[PDB]
Each structure stands twice: as structure tokens, then as C-alpha cells.
A paper describes a structure:
Type II topoisomerases (top2) regulate DNA topology which requires divalent metal ions (usually Mg2+) for their enzymatic activity. Metal ions are also known to be essential for fluoroquinolone action in bacterial top2, including gyrase and topoisomerase (topo) IV, which are heterodimers in their active form. Fluoroquinolones act by stabilizing the enzymes in a DNA-cleaved state and subsequently causing bacterial cell death.
[name] topo IV ParE30-ParC55 was cocrystalized with an 18 bp dsDNA, stabilized by a fluoroquinolone delafloxacin. Using this instrument, we are able to pinpoint the location of Mg2+ ions in the fluoroquinolone (delafloxacin)-stabilized [name] topo IV cleavage complex with high confidence. One pair of Mg2+ ions (one in each asymmetric ParE–[name] subunit) is bound to each of the two delafloxacin molecules that is hemiintercalated into each DNA strand. Although the full octahedral coordination was not observed in this relatively low-resolution structure, this Mg2+ pair is believed to coordinate the fluoroquinolone molecule through water–ion bridges with a serine (S79) and a downstream acidic residue (D83) that are conserved across bacterial species. The second pair of Mg2+ ions is found at each catalytic pocket of the ParE TOPRIM domain coordinated by the aspartate residues D506 and D508, which correspond to the proposed B-site. This is consistent with the observation of a single catalytic metal at B-site in many other drug-stabilized topo complex structures, which is likely representative of the involvement of Mg2+ in stabilizing the DNA-cleaved conformation. We identified two pairs of K+ ions (one in each asymmetric ParE–[name] subunit). The K+ site is remarkably conserved especially in topo IV of Gram positives suggesting a subunit-bridging role in these enzymes, though divergence of M101 (to G) and N105 (to W/F) in other bacterial top2 might affect K+ binding and enzyme function. A second pair of K+ ions is located in the [name] tower domain coordinating between F316 and N324 (FKYTDLQ), specifically F316, K317, T319, and Q322 and further coordinated through water networks to D320 and N324. Although Cl− are not typically associated with topos, we identified a pair of Cl− ions coordinating between ParE C-terminal residues E609-D610 and [name] N-terminal residues L9-E10, potentially supporting additional structural integrity.
Numbering used by the authors:
A (entry chain B), B (entry chain A): 411 to 648, 1001 to 1485
The structure:
DNA sequence: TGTGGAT
DNA sequence: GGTTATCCACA
DNA sequence: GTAATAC
DNA sequence: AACCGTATTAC
């Protein structure tokens, strides 16, 4: 039992019986509770189903998921498939109406297309369509509720019953009671299915192969040609009852949805702040709840739950793991999260679960969020429109290069290594002064990656290649040294190992060399590392060739590796392969937007204030007259009107005056107000200049970047060699 | 298979090596990272370890946990045990410094006492002792590393720089980095151990048996005699270095701590609101965050995380399960939580995890929390003194009987069944009017339990026994009926089953009767239930004695069971076996406290306001003088002083006047103020009367209880017979 | 054997 | 997301 | 055969 | 709390 368990129908009836294939055991539960057991069976699917186009045939029939699905249908597969031996008249695929749901449908259809074709062409495979929306009228036991799949139906409901009704946007099947699920999706009389058909065998074949086959480039090409990254889509105005659709159209619509989503909004970083959406949300949410470096740590489970509740509609598993990674300093050059407890190690042993650990933002993460409160960055509504979230962070340092990013999307992947903050900033500052700067010059400031794990990087020519094209291959090699021993014996001591390499497996792989005697002369392998340093010790036998051994180990173990740059990121909504120049130029452009926006915000504040202060200065000279005036008025409105009519204060000033507390009349110091007036006028001038002159703005940009480097700069860790 | 895995020391050295036995794999991780691997081994323990006194040797060595612990020490067990074959000189037990930690230590010591005695008396078992406190990582720029085990040591640390920098209270090992853990508790040079010794074999034997043996009554007696339920404790001035302690004293100190905690603060309900701490926290936290019945549902994971982060220092597993239970209407007579999604069923299939579901408080749960904002109920500080939490809820209905409670503590257990709200309130109302009311009379209003699952309760005489003494045994029997069929055949149709019985297992157990043919004449068993009703059908064969079958099924399946009342609850911090009379009288006494407290609160508001209004009325008559006065003052303080000195306003009035907005000086309408003054005086009179006359107060109490009954009353579900 | 808050 | 253990009391 | 967000 | 599967890309 690696596969979900079948809950059968009460009877045997191939004419009528239906097999529901449900996304996840939990919804499988609800389905089992909500069904009509006389003729409806339930088989839950455990997450993502094997790609039957990519994988072998051997392996496909080692997949318990598949075998229990074959068995259950009771008609074998492929070669011998007999439709008259089927146990159900209908196979209904029921997933969340979200992207990952779309992906599962895709994966299943390419199973049935490739191994149970007669079933598909006989019109016996369907997609169940859960509702997207629920409208609720009153409260308590006077609730009242209806459902809607399109935006047009939803608009029709706003009349039907409105005048204070509210709306739930379903994010999955997991938010539905079994009776809700029956009424909308499982009841023959009221459900809405789509019947999958094959209109053209040729077009369907080609369509399945391009989207699901092991060849990446056709699929990428397809994505570039079909998905509009820049735009929105509009949902299929579903027809109540059955609706036919071609396998071709389904596969295209579904895979398109999924591709786009996991490109834009999962696996690939934004070119400006170098964050994936999950990471952005972790930081924003934590920041918003004041979980910052200067304040107490806060239980990880709390942070995670708020992230999941307010921003990120996905498993806690994913969120926590991401948050953990941001805290591991052997993975990030500048950690964005501090976390008390067991957050793993280089040995790759599992971190404590969120119930154990506690966490806060690091100091430098502060700087990613700097000036977010000042309308510096575009915000969007979250999934249930309760709350706005940033689409990108201000990013007062260029985090994409500094911490890098690895990911795997559809049609694209990324591997950007980390860099030294100070070097990166030196580069950015040069580029601010020299927009057309080329790679050779930039590489005087930014010579290459700087891994948190240190070690030796070799391959100047390929570093340059990578910085030009986004791709290159470099060599990363462990830092070693020899120690003499009693007996006329040596030992090799490793003190730094290559990025992304699991220490405990490295040590094991090395000891396999000894055990199998692949190279002569290894006495014993011992991991001697501790909380104060990395130290692997390879004790050699008496007079064995130290250099023969060390060379063998570099060659045939991960004591030395190749790192491959594949620098891909999201620029204007679309994925893009990019070198240093696009990266740095995008960052600069972004900081420009931030600073301008910041300065417009701060200037409006100072303006509004100065206008008040100008009025208060006047008031003082006529204080008694103003009191008499207010006293002689009828009410708040009347008083303001008289202040305007009689002394030409503005509405804004009049409001300020009239809302002053009585005790203010004691303090009547004009010069302190005049000093404030002065400093405001100065402040507005500085800010106006920035808005009004690109050079002034860019000089500020550079000033701030240097302040950051000054504060956070650290020595390089990885040494660079040329060959 | 099932037990934690040993991470060994680099070398073999029985003279020096140490085996750390660690509470949980996660802390096992930290320990493994923090240790000095040359001589320190690590074996994690997975939660609670088998009680080697209660369970009998055989099952004890089918316990993988124990076998891998025997194996690891390498000296066999029992009478074989050879100390010179041990692999370590020291066996160090390292748990959280919390109650469940204490419990683990207990369980382990009774293993080593009973099966490895020479090891204990050779002074080779130890307890690890992690710190309770830390003087802030958020204390400027850190450089603080300051830890403390007692309150006295903590007071000594308060004389460190930053004159008011902060304190972390460690709740477990999970909040410590591996280097923190080394420095405080694993490093020979700086750790503080307790060395376990046997000072008196006889006293130790007796002490272990009473606390750990299968006999409950000696243990209860021990608890009654030793645990001070109404007191605080005080820790040992621990000695830097080793400190010796007798097995006897350790077992007593540790088990005492655990017993007390799981009696008062885990498994047993409070007699007034009928809640366990976890349940109270769920409701308080959810209410505080406005997650109420009239507002939209909110992701379960979010709720849980906030509960865990602010109030309840225990696993999410426990919290969520408790929250789920509060939503299942076949477990609670009046559900306190509404939950969208798969929250289980009577078939006992597993609920969806908190990442799937969403939830809010039910309408009636509102009434448990009613007037919490009004200082009606004692609050305590939470574990990290950031926030106060209620020790009991106001409880505007008598939830203990209405929903009941089942639990298992140490020395005590509880089983209180649910009751019909209307009946319960009728009883309470009678008792308000008739304090000395006896059971016979009360049972005219409250005749017995009312299970949410319905069915038939038999045994009036035992119900009465239970209502007098707190114990009784009743019979709960499924609701059945016969249906005639075609071939001169009958079938038994069950429509309601007994409380706490899993339907799907019942159906299975019944079908096993058929399959094994234990009794003749069963044709087929069919669960025909659906989301609209429960319906099991037992089709009988032609001429089989349907009464012989039905009787066999009542006897030998859970189609009929015995329910045992064991009504135990917490009254003045101590556990107490109680009938209806203590229960109802405690509730009434509680509502009295609430209403008095409520009325004192509301009256203080009205008082403070009336005093303000009296002052404002005066001001108007002397408005010009008051302005001149303020104008002639120096500052806010000075103005108030002059208002007091010159016009005998109070501080409270003076503050109000001086903080008025200028536009208030328009108004000279005394009438509207006078009407408010009038209403306030009236309101205070009503409230004063309640505080000042028991009768008035109790009539209110009764009024409110009737309002509640009127609103929430539901027909009885369980029918009552006498057997 | 199995209830429900705990590890 | 299911599977697998223990504690505790009481029939 | 492995990285990291997802189911 | 560990153990167990999958998708997606590029060496
Ligand atoms: N039943 C279902 N489980 C999963 N699922 C979720 C995991 C997670 O949230 O981190 C996970 O780590 C995980 C590991 C597994 F090994 C795994 N396996 C299927 C078993 O046969 C092995 C599955 Cl399935 C896993 C799912 F995403 C959806 C499910 F319905
Ligand atoms: N490794 C550890 N696990 C647990 N633990 C925790 C559970 C929970 O928080 O809900 C749980 O449901 C659970 C079930 C188990 F079956 C179980 N088993 C021990 C295995 O051999 C089977 C264990 Cl251990 C369990 C622990 F509380 C502490 C741990 F270190
Ligand atoms: Cl087609
Ligand atoms: Cl002793
Ligand atoms: K068949
Ligand atoms: K850590
Ligand atoms: K190599
Ligand atoms: K003011
Ligand atoms: K539900
Ligand atoms: K029975
Ligand atoms: K005012
Ligand atoms: K007026
Ligand atoms: Mg989903
Ligand atoms: Mg996982
Ligand atoms: Mg603990
Ligand atoms: Mg569990």
C-alpha cells in the first residue's frame, strides 16, 4: 500500500457505476461520505501522478497508483484492453479547480490516452467541475447559500440575493462539506461534467507528445507560442449538464494554466528582489507581524499559519521548508531568517517541525522590506480579498545575485549561485555611473560567485561566459591541507567543500573508495567536524602516495564538482535567460522606481504638514480673536466656515485648528513652529530635486547602496583560480 | 523498525563514553550536532517510553525502544546483567525541563531500577538539566550569552547591562541551537548533572511501585497525601557540577510534578465551564481574533498556530484534534466549532489536516465567552508573559453537563455524558429558587443523559445513583425496527447507535457474526446510511428466529453497551468526584460571580462618565472663566492644577476638560447632557441593586438562563426507559 | 479494547 | 497524507 | 541522482 | 516524528 484505497460501490453494474478519481485522501474522504454508495466508487490519488509519456514502461507498471487503477477498472491495459470488461460506465476525474489540479488531470488523461484509448473515444472519461464561488445571505441558522462557476453566474447571484451578502472563493475541495460536494459535483441530477472526446487522433497525439514528452525544447517553444504571460485569461462559461471537449483542447487549456503559474508564481525568482512568491510572502507576513531581528523569536507554526491563512494557499510543509532554507547559512550567503532550534545541518539531517522551532527576520531582511510602508511598490489583493500583498519588495540590496536561486519550472529551470554583497554593490554602483558598461569591466568589481561554503572556484573563461549568456560551467573544488603524523604518515584534511554537497554522503562516498580499494593507501576516514569547524580527515597508510590519493578523490568523488550556471528569472512577467547586465540594469531600474515613489510619498506628507504649520503660525498672532470666533460659532461646520470667510484659512487648516485640544492654547511658541517650517521647506527642496533630476536621484541611489555595503560587507569565502 | 537510531561515538572507551538518551528525534538532532563525537553517543526516544512496572516482561522485550537500549549498553538485562560489559561510564537522560519531560525520566528510571539495578547503584545514571532562562539574544547586539536555572540565579542576572534587556523562558529543548545546548548541558566542563543513587533499597522499591504499578488506589492515595494542588513549588538551588539524589526523592519530585499538571491542566474539565485548558484556549484565541459564527471561516492552520504561539505550549496535533472534536456533532450535543471540510464521520475515518480545513466558533460558543471583555473572570499570564488568558470562561450555559467530558489523568479519570440543554437549565433554574433541592425533584426536570447519537438509555435507578455519587452504570441500546420482505423474510433496521461507537466497525463486527455463523440466520449486512440518515440493515434468512438474532447482537456486539458515569472535575484546583448537586451548585455560584463582576464593571464605566458629564455641565456656566484660565496656564499640567485649585474639578474632570477639542466651545446645550446624566443615574441604580441584593441578582441569573434555553433548546434525542 | 489529550 | 508506538483509568 | 517548491 | 511516492529541468 503506496496507493490510495478503493471504496467500492454497493453493487456491480457496469451500465451505471461511476469511479471517482479524487485529488488526495482527504477529499477522497468527503467524496466517500457525500456519495451515493449504490453505484459510486471512490479511488483517491496521492498527489502528482506519474507522467506516462516521460517514464519507461518498466517503472510505469511498478507504480502502485497505476496498477490499482488498472485493476479497479478491471479491463487490463494497452495490448489486452477490453472495454466490455470495464466495471464502470463513467470514470470521473475530480480535482481542485486550481493549477496543480489542472496538472493532475493532464497527467491522468495522458495515461488513458496512451493505455486505455478505447475508453476515452467511447466517451467514458469525464472531468467533474467543482464550483468556484459560494454566496451567503444571512447569519446563524438563517444563513442561505448558492453556488457559481463563472463570473457571469456570480454576477447573477449578486442580484438574486444581495443587500449585504458575502462571497467565498473556493481554493480547493478541502473547504467543502460532503453534502456541499454532493449537491454541486457528485449528484447526476445537478453536477456539471465535461466529457472528453477525441476529434482528431493526429492532432491529439501531437498535442500530448509536445506537452508531456521528455523533449523540453518543443514544450518550451509551445509555451512561448501559446501562453500569454502578459495577460489574463477569462474562464470557460460552462454549460450546465454535460459539455463535450476534445482531448487536444483540454490538454492545452490545462497544461497552459499550470505552466504559466509555476513559471510566474512558484519556481522562478523575480529579477528585481530575487525572490519566489513563497519567499516574498514569508518575509512580508513576518514583517507585518513585527517578527523582526530586534524583537523576540516567535514560534514557527504561528508564522507559517498566518502566511498560509493570509497569503499563500499551499501546504505548510512547503512554506516551512522554504522558511527553513532561508535560515541555513550554508545555503544562503546572507540569511534572511534567524531560527532557534534544529534547522538542519550540512549533513542534511531533517530539521525540527514547526511545532519545535522559533524564528524571526534577520537584520538584513529588514533592508529588503525598507520603505514598504511608503507606497514604493505595487500591491495586489490576496486570494480572498481581505488584504493586500506586495508583488515585489523594495530591495535595498540586490538579493538575486547575493543569495542566488535554484528552481525547476515547466519548460525552464534556474541555477544562480550566490555572490559577495560588497562585490555585487561595487558592480551596481559602477553601472549606475556607466550604463553601457561591459562584462570585462564589471568583472573588475564582481569577479565571480562567492559560496557560503567557500572552497575553490576554477574557470574564469566560463564565469565570463555565464555573465554574458546566463550559462557556463565552472569547477568547484574542496579546500585541503596535509598534516604529518607519527609513524611517517600523512593525512588529508578537508576544511571546505563544494556548494550544495551533503557532507555526510561525501564522507561515505570517500569511505567507499577505501572499502573497495579503488585507489591504494587509505587507512581510515573520519568526520571530525563540530560546531566550531568543518574537518574531514583521510588518514593515509604508511608511505602511500598522498597526491595519487587526493587526485583520485577529486576526480571520482564530489570532493570536486562542476557547477552549472543557468541564470533564469522573471522579467516583465515572462521568463528570461539573463547575464549580469540585465540583472544589474533591472535592479537599478527598480531602485529608481522605489526612490522616486518614496520621495513623492514623503514630499506629500511634508507639504500637508507645512500647510498646517503655516496656518498655526498665523493663528498665534490672532489667538484670542480665533477663540472668540469659534465660541461665537454654532458648531464644528459653522466655525470652520467662519475661519475661512474671516481669516482665509483653507479647509485643511480650519479643520486642524478646530480639532486642537484646549491645552494646546498654553503652548504658544512661534519660533519653534518657524524652525519646523524651515526644516520642512528644506526637506521638500531635497525631495523635489530627486523627483526632478535623474542625476540627483542616481547619486542618492549610490549613496544608499554604499551605506548598505558598509554595514553588511563580509570577506570573500570562495577563492578564485583561472583554469 | 520502530525505535530511534543510535549515532555512536567515534571510539570505544567504557571508562569515558557517555550515552545521551534524548526526548525526541528533533532534539536528538541538535544533540548530535552539538556533541563531542569522540566519546558522546546519542539515542533518541520516541515520546513516552513503556511503563516497565505496569506491563509484564515479555511484552517489555517486544518493545523495540527497550531492545535497542539494552543492545546499545551491551550488557544484557535483568539477572544476566554484567556491569563490566557496559559500553559507557555514564547514561545521561536529557529531556525538556517540563512536566512530560519529568514523566519520561520517571519511566526510564523504573526501567533501570527494575532491569539494570547495579548500573544505578554504581552511580552511572544521570539527569541532564537544561537551563530554564536566557538573558536575551535581542539585547542590543547580543554579546550576552547568559543562562539561568533557578529564580535566584535569574535575579542575579538582572544585574547585567542594558538596564532592562529581555528574558527568554525555555519551554523545551527545541528552542536551543546545538551550540547553546553544548555550552549549557552537554559539555563536561560546564554542564550540571544530577547523579541518581539508591540510598535505601526498601524505600526505593516501595516508592517505585506506588507510582508506577497497576494499582490505582495506592497511587491516588499518594497523590492526595503529597501533591499540594493549591500551592506553588520552588525549584532546587541546583549546584554547579554534579549533585547526588536518591531514586526515591527523584521519582517523587518528578511524578508529583507530572501528576499535578495533567490533573489540573490537561485531562480533567473545570466544574464551572466544563472545559479542559486546551479547549478553553481554542475558544478564547479564536474569539479574540474575531473568528466567530457571523464572520467568514478561517484556515484551521492559522487558528492553531496562534493558539500554539500565544497560549498552549504543545503539539499542533493535539490542538487541532481537540478543535476538530469540538466540531463533530455526533460527539458534542452542542458543537462549539463549525468547520468546513472533512472533519471526520461516525465511521471514524480520519479528518483532513489543518492545511485543508477552515473553521469558526459556533453561535452558542459565543455564549460561553459572553461578557469576557468585562473583567468577569480571572486572567493569568501566558507562558512567556506577553499576554493574559482566562482561567475559566463566563459560561452563560452549563456546558459541563450539556456537552460532557471524557478524560484519563493520573490517579483519576472522567466520563460525564452529554445532556439536553433545556432540561439542564430547567434544573438549574429550580435550584436557584430551591438551594436544598434533592435529586428526586431535580430529576423531574433533568431525567437523564441525552446523547447526540440518540438511542435508548435504560436504568433509571443507576442514573439516580450516578446523579448522587458521580458513578453509575446504564445501558445504551440501538434504536431498531423490523421490516417485512418478499419471500416471507424480515430484516432488522438500525437507525440510531450508542454514543462513542464507531459505525463502520460495528457493521463489520456484525458481518463477522454472519461470516462465522456464530448464531444462525443472517442473510446479509448492508450499511445503507448516507448524508441524510443512519440506516444499517440486517437481512435475515427465511425462518430464522429474529429475536434470537437481535438478542445475540445486543449481547455480543456494541449494538448495545454499558455506559459508565465517572463524573470527575476540577473544583478549587483539586479533582473531585461529584453528582448533579455539586455540579449545578458550582455553576450557580460561578454565574453569581460573573454577574456581580459584570455589573461592577458596567457601573464603573457609567460612574466615570457621569462624573465627567457633571463637570461638563458646570463648565458651560463658567466657560469664559475656564478659557481665560487655560490661556493663563503654562502647560497641560498647570492648567489642570488651576482647574482643581480654582474651581474644584477633580483630576478626572480636569483631564477631560483640557483634552476637549476647540470646536466643543460652540455648544452651550446643557439639556442633552442632563438627559444623559439622568440615564446614567438610572443605569447605576439598577446595577447597584444587583450587587446589593441576592434576590435581584438571582432573578437576573434566571432571566438570562431562560433567554438561552428559548434560543437554543432542542428536542431530546435519547429515549429513557427503566431496564 | 478503546476512550482523548499528550510525547 | 497514512502507517506506526507509547502514557493514563476503567469497565 | 539531485537540487526545491508543489501535490 | 520517520518513512514512503510523484512533477518539473539540466548536467
Ligand atoms: N497521501 C498523500 N500524501 C502526499 N504527500 C505529501 C507530503 C508533504 O505534504 O510533504 C509528503 O512528504 C509525501 C511523501 C510521500 F512519501 C508520499 N507518498 C505517497 C506514499 O505512497 C508515499 C506522499 Cl503521498 C506525500 C500528498 F501530496 C498527497 C496525498 F494524497
Ligand atoms: N518520532 C516521534 N514520534 C512521535 N509521535 C508523534 C505523533 C503526534 O505528534 O501526533 C504521533 O501521532 C505518533 C504516532 C506514532 F505511531 C508514533 N510511533 C513511534 C513509531 O515507532 C510509531 C509516534 Cl513516535 C508518534 C513522538 F511523540 C515523538 C517522537 F520522537
Ligand atoms: Cl482531439
Ligand atoms: Cl533511594
Ligand atoms: K469485469
Ligand atoms: K539553528
Ligand atoms: K569529481
Ligand atoms: K491636538
Ligand atoms: K465538515
Ligand atoms: K454488547
Ligand atoms: K472632544
Ligand atoms: K450650539
Ligand atoms: Mg489545491
Ligand atoms: Mg515531504
Ligand atoms: Mg515538552
Ligand atoms: Mg498522530
Amino acid at each position: 500500500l503506496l496507493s490510495g484505497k478503493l471504496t467500492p460501490a454497493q453493487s456491480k453494474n457496469p451500465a451505471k457505476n461511476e469511479l471517482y478519481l479524487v485529488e488526495g485522501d482527504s477529499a477522497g474522504g468527503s467524496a466517500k461520505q457525500g456519495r451515493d454508495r449504490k453505484f459510486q466508487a471512490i479511488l483517491p490519488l496521492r498527489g502528482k501522478v506519474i507522467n506516462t509519456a516521460k517514464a519507461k514502461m518498466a517503472d510505469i507498471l511498478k507504480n502502485e497508483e497505476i496498477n490499482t487503477m488498472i485493476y479497479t477498472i478491471g479491463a487490463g491495459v494497452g495490448a489486452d484492453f477490453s472495454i466490455e470488461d470495464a466495471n464502470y460506465d463513467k470514470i470521473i476525474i475530480m480535482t481542485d479547480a486550481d493549477t496543480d489540479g489542472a496538472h493532475i488531470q493532464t497527467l491522468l488523461l495522458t495515461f488513458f490516452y496512451r493505455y486505455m484509448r478505447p475508453l476515452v473515444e467511447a466517451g467514458h472519461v469525464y472531468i467533474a467541475l467543482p464550483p468556484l464561488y459560494k454566496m451567503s445571505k444571512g447569519k446563524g441558522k438563517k444563513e442561505e447559500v448558492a453556488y457559481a462557476w463563472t463570473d457571469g453566474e456570480l454576477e447573477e447571484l449578486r442580484k438574486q440575493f444581495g443587500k449585504g451578502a458575502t462571497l467565498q472563493r473556493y481554493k480547493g475541495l478541502g473547504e467543502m462539506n460532503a453534502d456541499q460536494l454532493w449537491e454541486t459535483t457528485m449528484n447526476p441530477e445537478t453536477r456539471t461534467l465535461i466529457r472528453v472526446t477525441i476529434e482528431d487522433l493526429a492532432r491529439a497525439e501531437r498535442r500530448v507528445n509536445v506537452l508531456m514528452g521528455d523533449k523540453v525544447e518543443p514544450r518550451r517553444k509551445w509555451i512561448e507560442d501559446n501562453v500569454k504571460f502578459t495577460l489574463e485569461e477569462a474562464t470557460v462559461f460552462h454549460m450546465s449538464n454535460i459539455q463535450n471537449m476534445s482531448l487536444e483542447d483540454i490538454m492545452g487549456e490545462r497544461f497552459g494554466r499550470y505552466s504559466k503559474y509555476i513559471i510566474q508564481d512558484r519556481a522562478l525568482p523575480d529579477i528585481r528582489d530575487g525572490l519566489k512568491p513563497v519567499q516574498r510572502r514569508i518575509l512580508y507576513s513576518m514583517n507585518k507581524d513585527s517578527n523582526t531581528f530586534d524583537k523576540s523569536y516567535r514560534k514557527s507554526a504561528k508564522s507559517v499559519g498566518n502566511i498560509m491563512g493570509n497569503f499563500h494557499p499551499h501546504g505548510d510543509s512547503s512554506i516551512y521548508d522554504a522558511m527553513v532554507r532561508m535560515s541555513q547559512n550554508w545555503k544562503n550567503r546572507e540569511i534572511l531568517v534567524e531560527m532557534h532550534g534544529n534547522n538542519g545541518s550540512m549533513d542534511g539531517d531533517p530539521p525540527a517541525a514547526m511545532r519545535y522551532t522559533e524564528a524571526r527576520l534577520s537584520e538584513i531582511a529588514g533592508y529588503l522590506l525598507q520603505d514598504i510602508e511608503k507606497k514604493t511598490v505595487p500591491f495586489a489583493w490576496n486570494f480572498d480579498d481581505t488584504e493586500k500583498e506586495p508583488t515585489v519588495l523594495p530591495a535595498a540590496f540586490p538579493n538575486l545575485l547575493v543569495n542566488g536561486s535554484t528552481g525547476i519550472s515547466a519548460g525552464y529551470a534556474t541555477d544562480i549561485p550566490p555572490h559577495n554583497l560588497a562585490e555585487v554593490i561595487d558592480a551596481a554602483v559602477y553601472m549606475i555611473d556607466h550604463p553601457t558598461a561591459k562584462i570585462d569591466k564589471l568583472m573588475e568589481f564582481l569577479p565571480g560567485p562567492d559560496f557560503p561554503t567557500g572552497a575553490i572556484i576554477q574557470g574564469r573563461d566560463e564565469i565570463k561566459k555565464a555573465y554574458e549568456t546566463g550559462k557556463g560551467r565552472v569547477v568547484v573544488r574542496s579546500k585541503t591541507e596535509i598534516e604529518k603524523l607519527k609513524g611517517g604518515k600523512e593525512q588529508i584534511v578537508i576544511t571546505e567543500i563544494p556548494y550544495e554537497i551533503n557532507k555526510a554522503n561525501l564522507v561515505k562516498k570517500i569511505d567507499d573508495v577505501r572499502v573497495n580499494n579503488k585507489v591504494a593507501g587509505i587507512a581510515e576516514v573520519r568526520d571530525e567536524s563540530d560546531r566550531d569547524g568543518l574537518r574531514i580527515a583521510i588518514e593515509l597508510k604508511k608511505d602511500a602516495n598522498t597526491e595519487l590519493v587526493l587526485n583520485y578523490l577529486f576526480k571520482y568523488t564530489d570532493l570536486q564538482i562542476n557547477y552549472n550556471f543557468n541564470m533564469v528569472a522573471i522579467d516583465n512577467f515572462t521568463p528570461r535567460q539573463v547575464g549580469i547586465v540585465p540583472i544589474l540594469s533591472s535592479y537599478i531600474a527598480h531602485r529608481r522606481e522605489v526612490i522616486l515613489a518614496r520621495s513623492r510619498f514623503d514630499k506629500e506628507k511634508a507639504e500637508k504638514r507645512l500647510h498646517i504649520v503655516e496656518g498655526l503660525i498665523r493663528v498665534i498672532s490672532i489667538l484670542d480673536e480665533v477663540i472668540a470666533l469659534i465660541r461665537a460659532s454654532e458648531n464644528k461646520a459653522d466655525a470652520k466656515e467662519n475661519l475661512k470667510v474671516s481669516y482665509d484659512f483653507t479647509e485643511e487648516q480650519a479643520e486642524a485648528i478646530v480639532t486642537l485640544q484646549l491645552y494646546r492654547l498654553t503652548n504658544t511658541d512661534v519660533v519653534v513652529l518657524q524652525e519646523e517650517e524651515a526644516e520642512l521647506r528644506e526637506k521638500i527642496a531635497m525631495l523635489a530635486a530627486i523627483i526632478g533630476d535623474e542625476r540627483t536621484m542616481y547619486n542618492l541611489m549610490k549613496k544608499e547602496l554604499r551605506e548598505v555595503k558598509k554595514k553588511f560587507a563580509t570577506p570573500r569565502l570562495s577563492s578564485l583560480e583561472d583554469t
